[PDB]
Design a protein around this ligand. Sequence first.
Ligand SMILES: Oc1cc(F)c(F)c(F)c1
Ligand SMILES: Oc1cc(F)c(F)c(F)c1
Ligand code: SF4
Ligand code: SF4
Ligand code: SF4
Ligand code: SF4
Lengths: 441, 416
Amino acid sequence: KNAAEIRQQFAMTAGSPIIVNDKLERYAEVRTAFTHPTSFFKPNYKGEVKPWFLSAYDEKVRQIENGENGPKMKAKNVGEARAGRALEAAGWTLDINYGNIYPNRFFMLWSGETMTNTQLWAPVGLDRRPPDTTDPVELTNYVKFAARMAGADLVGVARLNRNWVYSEAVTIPADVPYEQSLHKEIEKPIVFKDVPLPIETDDELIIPNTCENVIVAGIAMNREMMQTAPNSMACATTAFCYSRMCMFDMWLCQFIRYMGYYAIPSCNGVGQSVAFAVEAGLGQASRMGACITPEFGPNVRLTKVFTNMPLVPDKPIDFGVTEFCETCKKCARECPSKAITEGPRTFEGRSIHNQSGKLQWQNDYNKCLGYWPESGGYCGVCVAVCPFTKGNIWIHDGVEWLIDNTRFLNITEVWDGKINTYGLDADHFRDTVSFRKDRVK
Amino acid sequence: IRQQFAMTAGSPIIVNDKLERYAEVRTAFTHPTSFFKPNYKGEVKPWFLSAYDEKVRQIENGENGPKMKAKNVGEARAGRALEAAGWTLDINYGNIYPNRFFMLWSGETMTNTQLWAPVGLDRRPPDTTDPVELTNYVKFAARMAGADLVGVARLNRNWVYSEAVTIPADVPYEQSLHKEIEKPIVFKDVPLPIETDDELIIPNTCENVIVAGIAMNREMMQTAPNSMACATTAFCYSRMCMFDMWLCQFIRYMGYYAIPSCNGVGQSVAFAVEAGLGQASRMGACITPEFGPNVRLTKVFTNMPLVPDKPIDFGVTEFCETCKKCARECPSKAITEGPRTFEGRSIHNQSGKLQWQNDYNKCLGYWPESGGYCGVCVAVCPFTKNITEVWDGKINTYGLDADHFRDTVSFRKDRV
Ligand SMILES: Oc1cc(F)c(F)c(F)c1
Ligand SMILES: Oc1cc(F)c(F)c(F)c1
Ligand code: SF4
Ligand code: SF4
Ligand code: SF4
Ligand code: SF4
């Protein structure tokens, strides 16, 4: 298997592959099902209406007391049930309020100046010295090497398409401490202005007009654990990867700053990761709505960093995902909430949670979120059943690579089974080896 | 290999009745007799500020290390930018202050604990007390948390620092370096790890230590003493910090307590030897079968019942007896060519244990000179096996190497 060959074979000519029409407007982040008032509240198993994640907490507690690893899924014993939720909770250690979405708060600072690392290194002046490299070719190789050190399994570069940057972010006022954060969330516009550096005022989050590029990282989840979806070990690989995302953003932003440029971290905030990942060539959009990659299918998390560092954009990739999703529909048939459409792509949002004006499969994300308190987790059944999540999809016919169409026709064993560092799989880890030739052309 | 070379139970570190616990302030990094070193202009400064001055001089002169020309100034800058960034999740080079910043001895105030409070995992008594099942659970968690190697030992208090270097609890970060103080670490009959005005208190119930190996990148370490060796060192310190926090939270959410440490609290090499990760060596590092000495260590202390691993003997002592390659290549002649003794060469060694006694002030003195963290000893050690070619060459996630990553695969059989 040769993952670099595969990406070269399916590379497209330059240009955003996302098809849009005149109804396209930037999307206010509060509209996501996690944050919008219509979807935020969900009943728990006693019928009490609560913030969805508190209702899900109630189900986790109920499952542990009943020796279960998920909905109607008996564990080996209560201790095993406990252990899965302890692993899940611990995975979130470096993530604020399920996704790090507040810009320029906590780990997501838009300047490095107050960070303990920046203060310690201040005598060297790396963040104040003008860049010594302005060549986009060399910078792309340097920043991608740094990205791999920082924990990305995939990395790509695109020009920043502002259509996918949230029109307004969900955040908290700068004087609000963490313990009041969930009670004091506000909206704040993200605007683009002729300023030298990213800056936040009382009224606006201001991205400079010089912010040309977005660097997108893929953070691979663990296949054995995700295949337990919707049960607790799928929750644990999800959670650990959010902390890996946070570390990636902070590491990479510091590298970029110490190279003489500015950098904006984001994790789940600032803009729509799937669209950036498609434009940076990590993969293609899919029926479930995730970015499907050749190496991991959709079983990969995304984060991204915005910067004025000159870079060479990667080419988008077309390995036939759209045509497979047209005929496959496994995620839609297996979805426990029937949130995923079995119909064609349109430009018309299904509800407030979708951004209208771009051609995509339109899914009902209030239905999806509704299953999370019911199951006490983050589901993931769609990722688990997608044939691209299997490690065995690619075959070579003597001339070229192709997808094997035959692919489209318990938790105790996970705890007792194969694992390796960060949940990566040495049987496939060669797929993400990188040399200069595949970092920049 | 690890099963083939398992020893019977029992600490393999030979001691005499002279041995006493070692005050952390005695390390060359911290002690007043070794802390101040001249820069290249002759100005005496804290040694790491003099090393900063050399990094700046090298960038200006288009160098990646001492008398090592870079491809250009841009390349020199990029190596130091990568090094500085690697340290993002590490306080003041090593996270040594206990119960400060990332190294909290309780999870109660952490943002993650607060968010998860309604589930009550940290307040609920353990549902598992079987050390066999716990050892399998916690080692699985350790691999998720970024350890390439993990082992368990009973806690030997001889390797716990008698007094830690820390700061007063209300001193802000901007004043930390100027207000470092000593503070005793003591063991008492208390329910939970607790810090008073006077003492860091570890419970007498704190039976076990979990030791993690965090693998460095071979291509980058082989550029020692130049900048890319500094970068793999730095990134692994941030990996250490995330490992400690992740694992401590897992242990707490299982109903036990956990003390993180990174480079603080105690001597990692001794813990790693007792937990079976590897053997002590002439250079002083723990040499592992998978990585040689090219691996960083961190550790977590806990009352969670666990099954101790066996120490390992794969012949490092006898190999180091005749090798002496690190000693001949050491740019500061810090590593001895003589035999092992129980007598330290200076304040920086803990006397009373059989080891190769090295002069660690000589080692530190080379760091301002070279503008880095050296590492030549690690780079040349047989067990471990230009900068433009590294930047243009092979890399993979976290610097791990897919040619060898199968060596750290793990199933239950090898976890307990
Ligand atoms: O983006 C996410 C937000 C959440 F609240 C979750 F629980 C989760 F697993 C992912
Ligand atoms: O000479 C000292 C060095 C240190 F690191 C201290 F913690 C201290 F109190 C005295
Ligand atoms: S399961 Fe099938 S339809 Fe759904 S995303 Fe995967 S390939 Fe597309
Ligand atoms: S996460 Fe679960 S409920 Fe949501 S779309 Fe996927 S399968 Fe459906
Ligand atoms: S780090 Fe360098 S100076 Fe220090 S002991 Fe090793 S070779 Fe010698
Ligand atoms: S270089 Fe030789 S003597 Fe030194 S630590 Fe390695 S094997 Fe031992």
